[PDB]
Every structure is written in structure tokens, then in C-alpha cells.
């Protein structure tokens, strides 16, 4: 399990300043001359947004003031000139091998396809949950893979499960045995079934689509997230 160390964990800067964030990986994420490191931006209340994939490639629509660099175990995200709209939390993520892992984020404080989750709510410990991600504006059969990713309260992002276009499923060993992912083409929906829930399963659960390119396991499209609360 590749672990990612993000530094600093938070920082204050002024508009117009250069900002640099570093990500250290506990193991190389290089493969065939490329580095499978990705950067996301998350504003409060919203799902993460993909900024960078394969260490240095800009996602479409991302402003040129964002740049990524590095290789091996050592990676950097640079904002050349901080703008007001850049106050957010920034996450690195490796897509070199499963389980795909995220850093715990850098909070930067200053001075068409749509995915809709349902099925969350308050459950008792030991109970079960079923989440659905309805895909609209896009055929579920067109996607390379569909994923569930959860965000524990005030904590790091955790990839949980995936199903590819050929039906192959994959789970994070942190949850495996209590979790099933499934797909329904005729309803353009996929599902997460959760059983024997524990308190550490309390989180916002996101659905997200994988990519056909550049190692697949970075996530350009996310749902709104649904809150699962396991309490008494």
C-alpha cells in the first residue's frame, strides 16, 4: 500500500504569491517513463476536481498557473500566481497500483455527464447500506471504470471499489469482504452494497469515473457525495 506524505498540511498566502506543495510517495509511482501522480482541488462542500494527471499533464480547462513536476517518489504542485478562486484543499493521488491512495491534503487559506449518489443516511453499527450512482448525460457503458471513494470526517480520501467496463471488480483490502460493487446497464446506474458497518465507515461517499488514458485510475468526473453516518 503506497502511502503519500503531503507537505505542508496547511498554509496561508496572499493573492499573487507563488505557492508550492510537495507530495512524497512511500514507493515509486514511475512506470514506462511516466509518473502516475495526480493532483486534485477541493473547495468546501464540493467534490474534488482533477487538475493534473501523470505528474505534469494539465486537465482540460485548468488554468496554466497550475503546474506539476517530479518523478519517482517526489512530486510538486506549483501555483505560479495565487488567485482568489484558488483557496481550497489540494490532494495528491497515485494511480500506479491498487489500492489507489490519496495524500491527506494541503489546505491553502488565502490571507454533459453528471453523477448523482443516493442511499446514504444514518445507520446503526452492524447494519447495512446500499448506495446508487445514477449516471446522466452519458452512457454507463462508455466509461472505462466506475468507482466509489469515501472521505472520512476531516480526514483523507480513500478509494474503496471499482468496476471496469468488462465487469471486473476490485476492492480496497481495508474494506474487502464487507463490500460489493455492481453495475446495471439498463438503468445507467452502479451500486455499492455495504454490510456490517462499523463507526470508521462514517464518511461522505463519492462515485467517480475512471479514464481510458494514462493509466486509467485518475478521476475526472465525480458525483456530489452522500453522507453515511454510522452511530447509535
Author numbering: 1 to 111, 1001 to 1121
What does the paper say about this structure?
Immunoglobulin E (IgE) plays a central role in the allergic response, in which cross-linking of allergen by Fc∊RI-bound IgE triggers mast cell and basophil degranulation and the release of inflammatory mediators. Omalizumab is a clinically approved anti-IgE monoclonal antibody that binds to free IgE, also with high affinity, preventing its interaction with Fc∊RI. Instead, the Fab alone selectively crystallized in different crystal forms, but their structures revealed intermolecular Fab/Fab interactions that were clearly strong enough to disrupt the Fab/IgE-Fc complexes. Mutations were therefore designed to disrupt two recurring packing interactions observed in the omalizumab Fab crystal structures without interfering with the ability of the omalizumab Fab to recognize IgE-Fc; this led to the successful crystallization and subsequent structure determination of the Fab/IgE-Fc complex.
We also attempted to crystallize the complex between a single-chain form of omalizumab (scFvXol) and IgE-Fc, but were unsuccessful. However, we solved the crystal structure of scFvXol alone, in which the light- and heavy-chain variable domains are connected by a (Gly4Ser)4 linker, to 2.3 Å resolution. The scFvXol structure contains one molecule in the asymmetric unit. In this structure, the β-strand-mediated crystal packing interaction observed in the FabXol1 and FabXol2 structures is absent, as the construct lacks the Cγ1 and Cκ domains. However, CDRH1–3 residues from a symmetry-related molecule contact the VL domain of scFvXol in a similar manner to the first interface described for the FabXol1 and FabXol2 structures, although the interface area is reduced from ∼395 to ∼290 Å2 due to the absence of the Cκ domain in scFvXol.
